[PDB]
């Protein structure tokens, strides 16, 4: 998150890089996760309070 | 139900055995149009994670 050094390294536009960074953000990291997402319920209670 | 204006006659075999020939005006005037309502539900089902 060292945006200043990133700017002085890339010679890139000031605060016009934000939309490019957002484009990078909207890129679906970890794409294979969405093939199946079912997770079960595993809970067992030992003591009950009501 | 609705009071349909029926006619008793064969018509080119489109009412062959127990089939019915219906005018397009019946569909246009929205007779026999029906509303159906369904139920969908989801639960949270807390986990140990």
UniProtKB/TrEMBL annotation, chain A:
Domain of life: Bacteria
Coiled-coil spans in chain: none
Annotated family: Belongs to the sigma-54 factor family.
Known role: Sigma factors are initiation factors that promote the attachment of RNA polymerase to specific initiation sites and are then released.
Protein name: RNA polymerase sigma-54 factor
């Amino acid at each position: 998150h060292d945006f200043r050094t990133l700017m002085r390294v890339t010679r890139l536009k000031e605060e016009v890089l934000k939309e490019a960074v957002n484009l990078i953000q909207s890129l679906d990291p970890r794409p294979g996760q969405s093939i199946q997402t079912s997770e079960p319920e595993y809970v067992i209670p030992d003591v009950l309070v009501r | 139900g609705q009071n349909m204006r029926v006619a008793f006659m064969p018509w080119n075999g489109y009412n062959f055995e127990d089939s019915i020939l219906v005018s397009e005006r019946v569909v246009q005037e929205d007779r026999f149009t029906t509303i159906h309502i369904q139920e969908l539900a989801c639960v949270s089902r807390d986990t140990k994670l």
